[PDB]
């Protein structure tokens, strides 16, 4: 269960991985094959906001829905 | 601006 205050003292090489490994199983719920690479669209956004997703199932969704738009359009 | 090219996150590394 991730704090902003936990994830900014582990090292910046190592953050993306920890909301990664979070963020990958949720997602999985919602698009089964295509979690690895919604997650990966998804990592680029600012930690802050990846930290919020993971708490609110709403704004998670709202992004998730945001990523697989831009899949749709590019086949 | 979400990327349609970033990486797949988590994919396995096996021959």
């Known amino acids: 269960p991730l704090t902003a205050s936990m994830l900014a003292s582990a090292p910046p090489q190592e953050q993306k991985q920890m909301l990664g490994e979070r963020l990958f199983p949720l997602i999985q719920a919602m698009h089964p094959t295509l979690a690895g690479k919604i997650t990966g669209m998804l990592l680029e956004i600012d930690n802050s906001e990846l930290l919020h997703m993971l708490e609110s199932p709403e704004s998670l969704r709202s992004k998730v829905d945001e990523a697989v738009a831009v899949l749709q359009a590019h086949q | ?15």
């Open chain 2, 1 to 15: 601006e979400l990327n349609p090219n970033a990486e797949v996150w988590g994919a396995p590394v096996l021959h």
